[PDB]
Design an enzyme around this catalytic site. Sequence first.
Site, PDB file in Angstrom:
ATOM      1  N   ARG A 102       0.822  -1.204   0.000  1.00  0.00           N
ATOM      2  CA  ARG A 102       0.000   0.000   0.000  1.00  0.00           C
ATOM      3  C   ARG A 102       0.858   1.257   0.000  1.00  0.00           C
ATOM      4  O   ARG A 102       1.890   1.296   0.616  1.00  0.00           O
ATOM      5  CB  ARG A 102      -0.877   0.042   1.225  1.00  0.00           C
ATOM      6  N   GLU A 144      -3.271   7.949  -5.351  1.00  0.00           N
ATOM      7  CA  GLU A 144      -3.631   7.300  -6.604  1.00  0.00           C
ATOM      8  C   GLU A 144      -4.860   8.001  -7.119  1.00  0.00           C
ATOM      9  O   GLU A 144      -5.675   8.430  -6.332  1.00  0.00           O
ATOM     10  CB  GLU A 144      -3.919   5.816  -6.416  1.00  0.00           C
ATOM     11  N   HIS A 149      -1.563   0.204  -9.843  1.00  0.00           N
ATOM     12  CA  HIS A 149      -2.341  -0.643  -8.938  1.00  0.00           C
ATOM     13  C   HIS A 149      -2.944  -1.835  -9.643  1.00  0.00           C
ATOM     14  O   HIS A 149      -4.161  -2.013  -9.611  1.00  0.00           O
ATOM     15  CB  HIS A 149      -3.457   0.111  -8.218  1.00  0.00           C
TER      16      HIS A 149
HETATM   17  N1  LIG Z   1      -1.076  -4.133  -4.970  1.00  0.00           N
HETATM   18  C1  LIG Z   1      -2.075  -4.975  -4.950  1.00  0.00           C
HETATM   19  O1  LIG Z   1      -2.934  -5.085  -6.023  1.00  0.00           O
HETATM   20  C2  LIG Z   1      -2.348  -5.801  -3.749  1.00  0.00           C
HETATM   21  C3  LIG Z   1      -3.045  -7.001  -3.833  1.00  0.00           C
HETATM   22  C4  LIG Z   1      -3.283  -7.702  -2.660  1.00  0.00           C
HETATM   23  C5  LIG Z   1      -2.850  -7.187  -1.444  1.00  0.00           C
HETATM   24  N2  LIG Z   1      -2.169  -5.997  -1.416  1.00  0.00           N
HETATM   25  C6  LIG Z   1      -1.688  -5.397  -0.157  1.00  0.00           C
HETATM   26  O2  LIG Z   1      -0.742  -6.185   0.515  1.00  0.00           O
HETATM   27  C7  LIG Z   1      -1.174  -6.356   1.847  1.00  0.00           C
HETATM   28  C8  LIG Z   1      -0.737  -7.727   2.319  1.00  0.00           C
HETATM   29  O3  LIG Z   1      -1.484  -8.690   1.655  1.00  0.00           O
HETATM   30  P1  LIG Z   1      -1.768 -10.063   2.425  1.00  0.00           P
HETATM   31  O4  LIG Z   1      -3.062 -10.690   1.992  1.00  0.00           O
HETATM   32  O5  LIG Z   1      -0.587 -10.938   2.301  1.00  0.00           O
HETATM   33  O6  LIG Z   1      -1.958  -9.550   3.920  1.00  0.00           O
HETATM   34  P2  LIG Z   1      -1.826 -10.648   5.082  1.00  0.00           P
HETATM   35  O7  LIG Z   1      -2.919 -10.503   6.057  1.00  0.00           O
HETATM   36  O8  LIG Z   1      -1.830 -12.041   4.624  1.00  0.00           O
HETATM   37  O9  LIG Z   1      -0.364 -10.277   5.667  1.00  0.00           O
HETATM   38  C9  LIG Z   1       0.041  -8.980   6.088  1.00  0.00           C
HETATM   39  C10 LIG Z   1       1.128  -9.097   7.163  1.00  0.00           C
HETATM   40  O10 LIG Z   1       1.719  -7.839   7.480  1.00  0.00           O
HETATM   41  C11 LIG Z   1       2.128  -7.878   8.842  1.00  0.00           C
HETATM   42  N3  LIG Z   1       2.429  -6.508   9.294  1.00  0.00           N
HETATM   43  C12 LIG Z   1       1.569  -5.493   9.615  1.00  0.00           C
HETATM   44  N4  LIG Z   1       2.287  -4.390   9.922  1.00  0.00           N
HETATM   45  C13 LIG Z   1       3.592  -4.664   9.809  1.00  0.00           C
HETATM   46  C14 LIG Z   1       4.746  -3.909  10.010  1.00  0.00           C
HETATM   47  N5  LIG Z   1       4.730  -2.647  10.398  1.00  0.00           N
HETATM   48  N6  LIG Z   1       5.968  -4.489   9.785  1.00  0.00           N
HETATM   49  C15 LIG Z   1       6.028  -5.810   9.380  1.00  0.00           C
HETATM   50  N7  LIG Z   1       4.890  -6.554   9.186  1.00  0.00           N
HETATM   51  C16 LIG Z   1       3.690  -5.988   9.393  1.00  0.00           C
HETATM   52  C17 LIG Z   1       0.979  -8.600   9.499  1.00  0.00           C
HETATM   53  O11 LIG Z   1       1.339  -9.113  10.727  1.00  0.00           O
HETATM   54  C18 LIG Z   1       0.620  -9.686   8.485  1.00  0.00           C
HETATM   55  O12 LIG Z   1       1.187 -10.970   8.720  1.00  0.00           O
HETATM   56  C19 LIG Z   1      -2.680  -6.162   1.886  1.00  0.00           C
HETATM   57  O13 LIG Z   1      -3.180  -5.653   3.106  1.00  0.00           O
HETATM   58  C20 LIG Z   1      -2.886  -5.188   0.752  1.00  0.00           C
HETATM   59  O14 LIG Z   1      -2.862  -3.849   1.190  1.00  0.00           O
HETATM   60  C21 LIG Z   1      -1.921  -5.302  -2.545  1.00  0.00           C
END
Ligand SMILES: NC(=O)c1ccc[n+]([C@@H]2O[C@H](COP(=O)([O-])OP(=O)(O)OC[C@H]3O[C@@H](n4cnc5c(N)ncnc54)[C@H](O)[C@@H]3O)[C@@H](O)[C@H]2O)c1
Lengths: 330, 330
Positions: A240, A269, A289
Amino acid sequence: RPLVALLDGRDCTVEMPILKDLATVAFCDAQSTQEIHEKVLNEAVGAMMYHTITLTREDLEKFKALRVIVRIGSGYDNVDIKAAGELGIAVCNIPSAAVEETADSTICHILNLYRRNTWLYQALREGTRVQSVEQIREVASGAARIRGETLGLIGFGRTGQAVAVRAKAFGFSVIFYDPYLQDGIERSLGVQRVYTLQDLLYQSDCVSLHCNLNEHNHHLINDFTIKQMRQGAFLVNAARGGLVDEKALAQALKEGRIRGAALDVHESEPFSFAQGPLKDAPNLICTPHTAWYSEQASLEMREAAATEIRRAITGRIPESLRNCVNKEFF
Amino acid sequence: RPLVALLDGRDCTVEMPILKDLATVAFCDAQSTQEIHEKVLNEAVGAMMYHTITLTREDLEKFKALRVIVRIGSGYDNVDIKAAGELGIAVCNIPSAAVEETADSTICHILNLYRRNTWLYQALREGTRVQSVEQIREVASGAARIRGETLGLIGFGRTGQAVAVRAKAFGFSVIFYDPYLQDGIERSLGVQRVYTLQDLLYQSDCVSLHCNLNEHNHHLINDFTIKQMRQGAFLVNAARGGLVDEKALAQALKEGRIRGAALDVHESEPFSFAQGPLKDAPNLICTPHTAWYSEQASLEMREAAATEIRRAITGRIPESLRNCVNKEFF
Ligand SMILES: NC(=O)c1ccc[n+]([C@@H]2O[C@H](COP(=O)([O-])OP(=O)(O)OC[C@H]3O[C@@H](n4cnc5c(N)ncnc54)[C@H](O)[C@@H]3O)[C@@H](O)[C@H]2O)c1
Ligand SMILES: NC(=O)c1ccc[n+]([C@@H]2O[C@H](COP(=O)([O-])OP(=O)(O)OC[C@H]3O[C@@H](n4cnc5c(N)ncnc54)[C@H](O)[C@@H]3O)[C@@H](O)[C@H]2O)c1
C-alpha cells in the site's frame, strides 16, 4: 426486498445473478461518500466496495440501515473498521483471491530491477541503437547477478510467503520481519527471521513491502528508516502507498542511496509521472495498482464478495461470515 | 612472439593482465572480417570473439597462423566450427558463465507477458490516468493467472533446465522437447518430456526457446510451425535470432494467433523498432541482447576466455582445452 449497494463501481454484473433472488442490487459509481445517493444511505443493508473510496467514522454514521460492508479485495485500510464495529456494522474482506497474482507481479518487479528488462525496452522505444558489446554493457549497466543477494520482506503473511516461495529458486537468500506473527513460520518455510525493522533494512539488498497498512505503520519507510538501508539497495512496494514517504524516497533515488524502486501503489492514486513528489525521480518503475489483477482473480473475488453478502442476509451477523475482519463489533 | 587478437571488441583490460607474461594481446574492434588488420591475419596464433562478428569458411582461410578461437560466451553459431577443425583450428566457448543471468532474464520476460508489467509502465509513461477499478481492468486487460498454464521449453540444456527450476514455484506445468538429450533428465528433474515439436507446440500456453542455433533448426518457429501453437499462446526467445521467422511471427501477432512475444535476440541485430519485419507488430517486448549480462557474469567469462587461451599456448591443442566444441579437428 433488501438493498445492496456497490459503492465505488459501475459494473455489477457478476454480483446481480448471485443475489437476484434475495436482494435488490445497485451500483453508485461514487468516488467519495458525498456522491452516494440519499436512497442508498437511508436503506442499504449491505455495501460492497473497492479500494478507490474511503469510509471514515463520520461517513459510516451517514448510513441509517447498513449491517455489513464487504471489501472486494484483501485490503481494508480504507474503512475505519473500529468505528464500523462500534456502530453495529460488520466488515469483511476477500483475503485470498489474488495472492499468487500479487506474488507473480512482485517477483516481476524485482526481476525488472535486477535485470532492467523494462528500462531496456524503454531504451529501445526511445530509439537507442545497441550494436557493439561495449554498448550492451553500457545500456544494461547495473544489471546484477541475483544469486547471493538478500531479499528482505516486511510482512510475512499471504503475499509475503508467496514471494518467498518464488524467490528461493533464483538464489535469493530470503529474510523477513513481521512483529505480529507467532514463532515458527520461519522454521516451516526454511527462511530466516529478524526481529527489528533496522536489522531487516541493514541486511537486505532488496526490500519488499507485504504488510497491511494499519494504525502503527504509516510511512514505515521514511526519512529515518531509508538511511538504515544498504547503499544502492532496491525498494519494492506492491502492498500500500502510505507505507512509503514518497518525498523521502524521491530524494534517496536522486542521491543514489537507493539504486531503484518499483511501485504498484502510491500515497496518492491514481498515479502520474507528471505529478507528485516522485515527479522527476530517476530509476523508478511504476504500475497503476494492478498487482492483483487477472481475469480469473477478478471474477473469483467478485463471486466471493457476493457470497459473503448472501451469508449476511440469510444468517446471523457476524457469526455466519467467512472473513469478518472486525470483531470489536457491537 | 605470440599474438592474441580480440576480434570484435575495443576493451581488452581483463584479458591483458591474465596473458601479459605469455602473449602480446591486441584488439581489432572489427565488426566484419574485412576490417581485421593484415598483421592479425598473418601472425595471430589465438583469437577471442563475441557474437557480433561471423567467421565463415572463407574467412577462416584468411588466417595464416591461427591455432585457437575462443568464444567469449556459450553460443558458437557465428563460427563455422567444422571448417575451423578441418583447417587445424580449435574452437572453444565459455558455456556456463551466464546461465543463471539468462534464466532470470527469461523468467522476467515470461512474467512480463503474463502480468504486463512492462506495458503498464509504458501506459503510465504515455500518460494514461488509471483511476477507477474498471479502468484498471481495462489497462491491465490480458493479465493472466499463471497457475495451471503449461510452459513449453524447446531445448533442455543449461538454460532450459535453469528456467524449469524457476518456473515450478509459479505453478507452471513444465514440458520440454530436446531430440538430442539422452533418456532420463525428465525423470531426474520431475518434468514431462514430449518427443516431437508439434506435441510441444500443441500443449504449450507459453513457448520458450533454449536451443543452440545449428545446421538443422534455422527458422524452427516458421509459418508452418506457428500454426501448430495454441490460439493466444505466448512466445519467448532469449536463445538466438534465427530460430524464429520474424515475418511469420509478425503476422501471427497482428492476427491475434499469438497473444504476445518477448525477444532478447533477433534475425538482424542490432534491433530497432523503426526497422524490419516486426516494424508495426503489436504486443511485442524486445531487449537488445542482454539476457547474458551482469557485472559479475561479464568478468567471469572474460577471465575464463583468457584462461582458455593460456592453456592453448602452454599445452597441446586440443587436449589441454577445457571447453573445445569442435573435435572434427585436424
Ligand atoms: N497491490 C495490490 O494489487 C495488492 C493485492 C493484494 C494485497 N495488497 C496489499 O498487501 C497487503 C498484504 O497482503 P496479504 O493478503 O498478504 O496480507 P496478510 O494478512 O496475509 O499479511 C500482512 C502481514 O503484514 C504484517 N504486518 C503489519 N504491519 C507490519 C509492520 N509494520 N511491519 C512488518 N509486518 C507488518 C501482518 O502481521 C501480516 O502478517 C494487503 O493488506 C494489501 O494492502 C496489494
Ligand atoms: N540471450 C543470451 O545472451 C544468451 C545467453 C546464453 C545462451 N544463449 C543461447 O541459448 C542457447 C542454449 O544455451 P545453453 O548454454 O543452455 O546451451 P546447452 O548446450 O546447454 O543447451 C542446448 C540444448 O538445446 C538442444 N537443442 C539443439 N537443437 C534443438 C532443436 N532443434 N530442437 C530442440 N532442442 C534442441 C541441445 O540438444 C541441448 O540440449 C545457445 O544458442 C545460446 O546462444 C543466449
